[PDB]
Symmetry: D2
Subunit: 30 residues, 4 copies
Amino acid sequence: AEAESALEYAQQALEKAQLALQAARQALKA
Amino acid sequence: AEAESALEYAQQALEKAQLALQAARQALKA
Amino acid sequence: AEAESALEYAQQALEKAQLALQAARQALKA
Amino acid sequence: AEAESALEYAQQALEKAQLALQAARQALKA
Ligand SMILES: c12c3c4c5c1c1c6c7c2c2c8c3c3c9c4c4c%10c5c5c1c1c6c6c%11c7c2c2c7c8c3c3c8c9c4c4c9c%10c5c5c1c1c6c6c%11c2c2c7c3c3c8c4c4c9c5c1c1c6c2c3c41
Ligand SMILES: c12c3c4c5c1c1c6c7c2c2c8c3c3c9c4c4c%10c5c5c1c1c6c6c%11c7c2c2c7c8c3c3c8c9c4c4c9c%10c5c5c1c1c6c6c%11c2c2c7c3c3c8c4c4c9c5c1c1c6c2c3c41
C-alpha cells in the first residue's frame, strides 16, 4: 500500500503548506 | 521575518507533496 | 497587490490539489 | 483511470501553486 501511504503523506504535506500560507497572508495584511 | 519563513516552509511542504505524488503515480502504472 | 494575489491564487490551487487527492484516495480504496 | 487523472490534475495544481509562491517570495524580498 505504498500508493495509499504516499497519498496520505501528500495530503498531510499539503495541509501543512495551507496553514503556513494562511499565516503568510495574515502577515501581509498587516 | 515570519511571512518569508512561512512561504519557505510552504514551498518545502509542497516539494514533499510533489515527490510523494510522483511515487503514487508510478505505483498506479505498475 | 501582486504578493497578496499570488498567495490567494496559490491557496486556490492547493484547494484544487486537495480535492483531487481525496478523489484519488477513494479510488484506491475501491 | 479516474485515479490517474486525479493525480495528474493534482500535480498540475501543485505546479501552479509553486510558481505563484515563488512570485510571492520574490515580492517579499523587495
Ligand atoms: C504555524 C505553525 C506552523 C506553521 C505556521 C506558521 C506561522 C505560525 C504558526 C505557528 C506555529 C506552527 C508551528 C510550526 C509550523 C511550521 C511552519 C509554519 C509556518 C508559519 C509561520 C508562522 C509563524 C509563527 C506561527 C506559529 C509559531 C510557532 C508554531 C510552530 C513552530 C514551528 C512550526 C513550523 C515552522 C515554520 C513554519 C512556518 C514559519 C512561520 C514562522 C512563524 C513563526 C511563528 C511561530 C513559531 C513557531 C514554531 C516555529 C516553527 C517553524 C518556524 C517556521 C516558520 C516561522 C517560525 C516561527 C516560529 C517557528 C518558525
Ligand atoms: C505568474 C503567472 C501565474 C502566477 C504567477 C504569479 C505572478 C506573475 C506570473 C505572471 C504570469 C502568470 C500568469 C498567471 C498565473 C496566475 C497566478 C500566478 C500568481 C502570481 C502573481 C504574479 C503576478 C504577476 C506575474 C505574472 C503576470 C501575469 C502572468 C499570468 C497572468 C495570470 C495568471 C494567474 C493569475 C494570478 C496568479 C497569481 C497572481 C500574481 C499576480 C501578479 C500579476 C502578474 C502578472 C499578471 C499576469 C496574469 C494575471 C493572471 C492572474 C493574476 C493572478 C495574480 C496576479 C496577477 C497579475 C497578473 C495577473 C494576475
